[PDB]
Design an enzyme around this catalytic site. Structure first.
Site, PDB file in Angstrom:
ATOM      1  N   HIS B 222      48.290  40.459  33.280  1.00 45.27           N
ATOM      2  CA  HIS B 222      47.014  40.276  33.971  1.00 45.27           C
ATOM      3  C   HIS B 222      45.930  39.781  33.012  1.00 45.27           C
ATOM      4  O   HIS B 222      45.163  38.868  33.345  1.00 45.27           O
ATOM      5  CB  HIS B 222      46.556  41.588  34.629  1.00 45.27           C
ATOM      6  CG  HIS B 222      45.198  41.512  35.254  1.00 45.27           C
ATOM      7  ND1 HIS B 222      44.997  41.381  36.605  1.00 45.27           N
ATOM      8  CD2 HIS B 222      43.951  41.522  34.691  1.00 45.27           C
ATOM      9  CE1 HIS B 222      43.698  41.311  36.867  1.00 45.27           C
ATOM     10  NE2 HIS B 222      43.052  41.395  35.715  1.00 45.27           N
ATOM     11  N   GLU B 226      44.411  35.795  33.093  1.00 47.24           N
ATOM     12  CA  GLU B 226      42.987  35.555  33.316  1.00 47.24           C
ATOM     13  C   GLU B 226      42.440  34.646  32.226  1.00 47.24           C
ATOM     14  O   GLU B 226      41.743  33.668  32.509  1.00 47.24           O
ATOM     15  CB  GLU B 226      42.197  36.856  33.300  1.00 47.24           C
ATOM     16  CG  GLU B 226      40.737  36.653  33.662  1.00 47.24           C
ATOM     17  CD  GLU B 226      40.585  35.926  34.996  1.00 47.24           C
ATOM     18  OE1 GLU B 226      41.234  36.358  35.985  1.00 47.24           O
ATOM     19  OE2 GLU B 226      39.824  34.927  35.058  1.00 47.24           O
ATOM     20  N   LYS B 229      43.758  31.066  32.571  1.00 46.25           N
ATOM     21  CA  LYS B 229      43.083  30.342  33.650  1.00 46.25           C
ATOM     22  C   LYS B 229      41.741  29.774  33.213  1.00 46.25           C
ATOM     23  O   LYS B 229      41.405  28.639  33.560  1.00 46.25           O
ATOM     24  CB  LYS B 229      42.869  31.248  34.863  1.00 46.25           C
ATOM     25  CG  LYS B 229      44.065  31.286  35.801  1.00 46.25           C
ATOM     26  CD  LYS B 229      44.122  32.572  36.622  1.00 46.25           C
ATOM     27  CE  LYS B 229      42.934  32.750  37.543  1.00 46.25           C
ATOM     28  NZ  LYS B 229      43.034  34.034  38.302  1.00 46.25           N
ATOM     29  N   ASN B 230      40.975  30.556  32.454  1.00 43.00           N
ATOM     30  CA  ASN B 230      39.663  30.102  31.995  1.00 43.00           C
ATOM     31  C   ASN B 230      39.750  29.032  30.931  1.00 43.00           C
ATOM     32  O   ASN B 230      38.977  28.071  30.944  1.00 43.00           O
ATOM     33  CB  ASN B 230      38.844  31.267  31.455  1.00 43.00           C
ATOM     34  CG  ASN B 230      38.462  32.242  32.539  1.00 43.00           C
ATOM     35  OD1 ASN B 230      38.222  31.840  33.676  1.00 43.00           O
ATOM     36  ND2 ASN B 230      38.390  33.529  32.195  1.00 43.00           N
TER      37      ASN B 230
END
Ligand SMILES: CCN(c1ccccc1)S(=O)(=O)c1ccc(NC(=O)[C@@](C)(O)C(F)(F)F)c(C)c1
Ligand SMILES: CCN(c1ccccc1)S(=O)(=O)c1ccc(NC(=O)[C@@](C)(O)C(F)(F)F)c(C)c1
Lengths: 353, 353
Positions: B222, B226, B229-230
């Site tokens: 997780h 995240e 993705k950024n």
């Protein structure tokens, strides 16, 4: 016998934050004289007013009282000129000398205060709340001092390309090389080995125009020199059985509002838990304060200084400065009902288990 | 009609922090049943007890009350078993089902609470003190939830190589590749271009033994997903007129006590002032919470997640985990007189000017 009175008076005013640009647009020392006559007293008073309000346990130590008496003298040293009139080409030189003398009277404030920290450690112990209050106070005290010294250096230097201690065309990479050269010299004399330097610039908006900014070069130097000393010590010691000695790499990046300087070393790194303690005045005292104070210099003009390493590999130290002289505004600590309750820490059993 | 009573009862106990090793040494679900019967209620109660003590302005919103009612139901859902006796091979399966049902009842707690944040923003405004209290509360609330879900997943998974959700031989680089692959897939579908991945390991003590640790792989996933993705979004968008697309580089370093994961992108970077706002629940709400919550997952086992970029160049995101299962102890928020005064923020005119 009116020191307590003066302090109460000027302690009612708030210090006036100046921007790096207003400092640059300077032009009559008369204008400065009349300004500094009120500003210096206000700043001395605010820092003095906060000191007087800390535990008598800390107040009674020779250290605190010793510097506390220096400020009292400096405050009185400037009072003289309150009723004085400029115009008199000697009324204002009496001032320049008055400042150069005040500055030197305070040259050893850091070591002296550090002594009180050590006194505290052995006299009352080193617990989180003690660390917290000292940290809180020393950060403000020191920042305050930096701002006072700034004004003084600006005046004295201006009224004996650069405007006082400010270089409107500061070439960052050049200051980088200077602090490196000096640290290298020391590193070579003590270890007889030193890592090399690599510098890389990233001028976002202008691909290859050298990176310049308006800044106080000696402040930037102090920060870089401290960081270089640590990165060298760690690189050298962590490879004492290796022959290879990785270089220290620095990147100077200029963005729309940030001018960042990253220094990366492969000095082994430090566990996250010890990083938090590297900026602590109390925990970094024995039996120096390069880091915590270097950070204050960064924050003084709205910048910052942060650390992040990888235990087992190396450490990145980043200095964040404002790219625009417009955004470079003095960050001043002030005495209010707000600053009062930060000393009311009655910690005992936290919110986490 | 005794919910308020139960909460007051169990709210007197403090949650019991468990270490990643105690979780691993698991072996009788009877032992677990009797333990969870008291622990879950204690944890539900502490988080519920803190909620009941926030402004009625926040309490009265459908959101808060809605979840507040979920917890009340979950608390009551487990009470049933307080007088029950194990031995009965059906008394404890009544429990496993009771947990699987409680878990699903709470699946949408994040979005639901986020809705209340948006409600607050438009109903009372977005000021520092509001941000501070929400930040303070949401961090604790969410962390608390993570810890509750951990216990539940450990029980349900164990009593349907891996011990529940824990992999004693978690190969970090492998989880890195997984989260990357998934982000890449999404990145390709939306931008039809995606940066590559480079991974480098630094096993300090053992030069080339692959880096393994005891951890909860889905938690690590997780966090990495995240961050990937950024870093992808930023790399792609910042080079929309460039043809070159720099890769995202990850370093996994294992030291004596830290296991660090750094993800470096050249996505343009972000001004220092906006970084501080990337982890804020309030400021990151409109018209997601990947970052602030990813960080909570890091902190849950004494780790952390930090960010530092260079405006105009790129960003480094570092996840700090404890290398030893011994040091990986649940970080739990607790209700005390200490946690009470963090909500007494009466800010109005600070200590700095
Ligand atoms: C604060 C008053 N200023 C202001 C601000 C807002 C609106 C209008 C005017 S100002 O820009 O006129 C100004 C700036 C620098 C100095 N002084 C100096 O540069 C130094 C060298 O004398 C010193 F020491 F103060 F830094 C002085 C005396 C005045
Ligand atoms: C806290 C009690 N422990 C302790 C601590 C200090 C000293 C002596 C003993 S323990 O190590 O015996 C222990 C560890 C894990 C679990 N449970 C589990 O692993 C799970 C799966 O049931 C759950 F959900 F609790 F995580 C349970 C029931 C007990």
């Amino acid at each position: 016998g009116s020191a307590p009175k003066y302090i109460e008076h000027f302690s009612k005013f708030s210090p006036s934050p100046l921007s790096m640009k207003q400092f640059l647009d300077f032009a009559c020392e008369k204008t400065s004289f009349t300004f500094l006559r009120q500003e210096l007293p206000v700043r001395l008073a605010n820092i003095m007013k906060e000191i007087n309000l800390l535990p008598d346990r800390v107040l009674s130590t020779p250290s605190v009282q010793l510097v506390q008496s220096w400020y009292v003298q400096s405050l009185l040293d400037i009072m003289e000129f309150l009723d004085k009139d400029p115009e008199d080409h000697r009324t204002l030189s009496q001032f320049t000398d008055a400042l150069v003398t005040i500055r030197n009277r305070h040259n050893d404030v850091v070591p002296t205060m550090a002594q009180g920290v050590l006194e505290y450690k052995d006299t009352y112990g080193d617990d989180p709340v003690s660390n917290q209050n000292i940290q809180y106070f020393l950060d403000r005290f020191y920042l305050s001092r930096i701002s006072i010294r700034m004004l003084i250096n600006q005046h004295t230097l201006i009224f004996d390309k650069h405007i006082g201690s400010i270089d409107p065309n500061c070439n960052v990479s050049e200051v980088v090389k200077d602090a490196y050269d000096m640290a290298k010299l020391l590193c070579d004399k003590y270890y007889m080995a030193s890592p090399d330097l690599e510098i890389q610039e990233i001028n976002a908006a202008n691909s290859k125009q050298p990176i310049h900014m308006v800044y106080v070069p000696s402040h930037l130097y102090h920060m870089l020199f401290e960081l270089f000393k640590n990165a060298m010590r760690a690189t050298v010691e962590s490879h004492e059985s290796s022959l290879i000695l990785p270089p220290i790499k620095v990147m100077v990046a200029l963005g729309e509002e940030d001018l960042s300087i990253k220094m990366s070393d492969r000095g082994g790194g430090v566990p996250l838990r010890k990083i938090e303690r590297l900026f602590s005045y109390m925990y970094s005292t024995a039996p120096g304060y390069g880091l915590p104070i270097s950070r204050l210099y960064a924050k003084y003009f709205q910048g910052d200084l942060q650390l992040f390493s990888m235990e087992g590999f190396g450490t990145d130290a980043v200095i964040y400065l404002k790219a625009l002289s417009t955004d470079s505004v003095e960050r001043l600590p002030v005495y209010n009902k707000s600053a009062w309750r930060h000393y009311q820490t009655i910690q005992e059993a936290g919110d986490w288990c």
